Amino acid sequence: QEPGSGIGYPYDNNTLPYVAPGPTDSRAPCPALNALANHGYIPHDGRAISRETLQNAFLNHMGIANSVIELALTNAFVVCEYVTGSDCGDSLVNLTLLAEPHAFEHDHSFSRKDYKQGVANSNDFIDNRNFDAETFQTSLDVVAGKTHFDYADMNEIRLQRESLSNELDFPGWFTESKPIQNVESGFIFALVSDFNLPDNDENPLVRIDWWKYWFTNESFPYHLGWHPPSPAREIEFVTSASSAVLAASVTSTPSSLPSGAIGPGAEAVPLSFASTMTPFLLATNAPYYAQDPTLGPND
Numbered sequence: 001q002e003p004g005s006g007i008g009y010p011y012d013n014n015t016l017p018y019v020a021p022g023p024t025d026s027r028a029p030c031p032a033l034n035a036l037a038n039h040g041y042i043p044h045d046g047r048a049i050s051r052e053t054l055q056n057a058f059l060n061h062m063g064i065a066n067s068v069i070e071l072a073l074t075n076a077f078v079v080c081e082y083v084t085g086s087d088c089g090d091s092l093v094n095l096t097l098l099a100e101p102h103a104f105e106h107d108h109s110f111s112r113k114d115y116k117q118g119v120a121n122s123n124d125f126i127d128n129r130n131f132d133a134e135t136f137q138t139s140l141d142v143v144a145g146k147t148h149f150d151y152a153d154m155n156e157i158r159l160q161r162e163s164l165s166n167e168l169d170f171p172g173w174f175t176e177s178k179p180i181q182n183v184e185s186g187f188i189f190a191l192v193s194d195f196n197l198p199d200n201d202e203n204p205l206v207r208i209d210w211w212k213y214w215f216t217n218e219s220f221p222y223h224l225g226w227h228p229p230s231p232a233r234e235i236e237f238v239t240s241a242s243s244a245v246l247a248a249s250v251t252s253t254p255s256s257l258p259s260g261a262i263g264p265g266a267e268a269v270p271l272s273f274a275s276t277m278t279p280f281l282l283a284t285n286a287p288y289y290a291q292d293p294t295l296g297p298n299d
């Protein structure tokens, strides 16, 4: 928000306004990175981003401590080198390359379509990067009529997404990614669980309106009473949440699940790509911004 607005105070005392991305700006498949870039906490153009810029932006403006993004940073730079064909050092070339499929970006996302979702021919691909309202609605529908949801609800959401993507993706494309997705499940609990409830750290409950605002608007739901978690969330919270989601009892089983869908997931580890391996082409679509309604500087 505008620095004089005080909207982030006393949690964030140095805010910057929302500015929609322009057609030439680079955006990510990540709702968190996109909100940071929309505010200029990382470059508005989404290019040439250092590890420290990311660390500072997450810590000071989202209440997400450095530990939470350590592996994320490693993987971002691994993918940069894979996509561009050379070491990117400490300047992530852009945010868009993070949508390289079957890498860091993965299938059965909560709010994005898959790279070969619903394509008529094996060589087609689609925008697996920008926010997709219809896809997000398939996540939200699992928790329809509710204001909050828990770990067991989240497990049902990710199961529904896996089922849908397994049915809809071009045959042979769909690849399950429980370890990456469920760190992101942990991320959702870390950022938009309701810290105003007394037992948030033991049994965190996602506020659906906060989640929807963050994903749909790629800006922060201060208007709905959200603020950055204080103290900043640490990796233990995230991976514990991740494990808790996957450990939660499934009371509604969708059909068309991949083998081993229900049950614990592997720990996420550094990505690695064969030097021989040619990256898939990136979707070239202009970055998404909210239009219904468009956002002001304080939204």
Ligand code: HEM
Binding pocket: 029, 030, 031, 032, 033, 054, 058, 064, 068, 069, 072, 073, 076, 098, 099, 104, 105, 106, 107, 108, 109, 110, 111, 112, 184, 185, 187, 188, 190, 191
């Ligand atoms: C350097 C730090 C980060 C990097 C490089 C990064 C990268 C990515 C990438 C490549 C994806 C796409 C995965 C897919 O859905 O196919 C993604 C998704 C996601 N990210 Fe980030 N991320 C970072 C930090 C964070 C943080 C700190 C949060 C929240 C606290 C966050 C929230 C999410 C969520 C919730 C998704 C899933 C979106 C969906 O499935 O529709 N990210 N991130």
Ligand SMILES: *[C@@H]1O[C@H](CO)[C@@H](O[C@@H]2O[C@H](CO)[C@@H](O[C@@H]3O[C@H](CO)[C@@H](O)[C@H](O)[C@@H]3O)[C@H](O)[C@H]2NC(C)=O)[C@H](O)[C@H]1NC(C)=O
Binding pocket: 024, 025, 026, 027, 083, 084, 093, 094, 095, 096, 097, 279, 280, 281, 282, 283
């Ligand atoms: C973010 O950075 C990535 C990685 O540098 C950009 O993707 C790459 O963009 C280049 C330059 O346009 C593409 O090279 C072109 O390839 C086409 C098709 O083969 C060829 O006709 C041209 O001669 C040119 O060399 C490259 O293919 C592409 N890489 C991948 C894997 O898709 C991306 O455009 C950047 N995005 C933004 C918004 O800045």
Ligand SMILES: *[C@@H]1O[C@H](CO)[C@@H](O[C@@H]2O[C@H](CO)[C@@H](O)[C@H](O)[C@H]2NC(C)=O)[C@H](O)[C@H]1NC(C)=O
Binding pocket: 209, 212, 213, 214, 216, 217, 223, 224, 290, 293, 295, 296, 299
């Ligand atoms: C996206 O952001 C806009 C702007 O903040 C949201 O619309 C506002 O919602 C706030 C509360 O967050 C209300 O006080 C205002 O009446 C709304 N303004 C307008 C122009 O409608 C919108 O709801 C957000 N989208 C989602 C899905 O949360």
Ligand SMILES: *[C@H]1O[C@H](CO)[C@@H](O)[C@H](O)[C@@H]1O[C@H]1O[C@H](CO)[C@@H](O)[C@H](O)[C@@H]1O
Binding pocket: 283, 284, 285, 286
């Ligand atoms: C991205 O641009 C490529 C050419 O620049 C196209 O081959 C791709 O299909 C893809 O096009 C989509 O996104 C661009 C925005 O850069 C639009 O101009 C297109 O109309 C399309 O939505």
Ligand SMILES: *[C@@H]1O[C@H](CO)[C@@H](O)[C@H](O)[C@H]1NC(C)=O
Binding pocket: 009, 010, 011, 012, 013
């Ligand atoms: C914001 O400023 C107030 C008053 O100076 C202070 O009490 C608070 O700690 C500050 N917040 C942060 C995160 O530094």
Ligand SMILES: *[C@H]1O[C@H](CO)[C@@H](O)[C@H](O)[C@@H]1O
Binding pocket: 178, 179, 180, 181, 182, 183, 186, 238, 239, 240, 242, 243, 246, 264, 265, 266, 267, 268
């Ligand atoms: C989230 O984190 C847990 C614990 O590391 C994993 O079990 C899960 O697969 C996901 O990566």
Ligand SMILES: *[C@H]1O[C@H](CO)[C@@H](O)[C@H](O)[C@@H]1O
Binding pocket: 235, 236, 237, 238, 239, 240, 243, 267
């Ligand atoms: C989540 O899981 C990681 C290991 O996967 C732990 O280091 C952390 O304490 C949390 O339980």
Ligand SMILES: *[C@H]1O[C@H](CO)[C@@H](O)[C@H](O)[C@@H]1O
Binding pocket: 200, 201, 202, 203, 204, 236, 237, 240, 241, 244
């Ligand atoms: C790990 O941490 C999470 C979040 O605090 C808890 O919900 C879980 O029960 C475990 O203690």
Ligand SMILES: *[C@H]1O[C@H](CO)[C@@H](O)[C@H](O)[C@@H]1O
Binding pocket: 239, 240, 241, 243, 244, 247
């Ligand atoms: C990972 O961690 C969660 C929360 O502590 C457990 O529920 C699960 O059994 C696994 O050990």
Ligand SMILES: *[C@H]1O[C@H](CO)[C@@H](O)[C@H](O)[C@@H]1O
Binding pocket: 152, 153, 156, 250, 251, 252
């Ligand atoms: C069984 O219960 C779980 C949560 O406990 C729900 O997510 C599911 O929809 C079903 O009612």
Ligand SMILES: *[C@H]1O[C@H](CO)[C@@H](O)[C@H](O)[C@@H]1O
Binding pocket: 141, 142, 156, 157, 160, 251, 252, 253, 254, 255
């Ligand atoms: C229980 O819930 C899951 C997730 O919503 C569905 O896939 C299933 O059809 C049943 O309604």
Ligand SMILES: *[C@H]1O[C@H](CO)[C@@H](O)[C@H](O)[C@@H]1O
Binding pocket: 249, 250, 251, 252, 253, 254, 262
């Ligand atoms: C739906 O079905 C699966 C097995 O088919 C169970 O694991 C799940 O708990 C639910 O009953």
Ligand SMILES: *[C@H]1O[C@H](CO)[C@@H](O)[C@H](O)[C@@H]1O
Binding pocket: 252, 253, 254, 255, 256
């Ligand atoms: C499709 O398959 C699942 C089990 O794999 C069922 O739970 C569902 O009701 C449908 O028959």
Ligand SMILES: *[C@H]1O[C@H](CO)[C@@H](O)[C@H](O)[C@@H]1O
Binding pocket: 271, 272, 273, 274, 275
């Ligand atoms: C990580 O592992 C891969 C194998 O997938 C190697 O190809 C790569 O060079 C790195 O050691």
Ligand SMILES: *[C@H]1O[C@H](CO)[C@@H](O)[C@H](O)[C@@H]1O
Binding pocket: 293, 294, 295, 296
């Ligand atoms: C997005 O742009 C529209 C232009 O009509 C405004 O209505 C809104 O305030 C926001 O700046």
Ligand SMILES: [Br-]
Binding pocket: 026, 047, 093, 094
């Ligand atoms: Br670029």
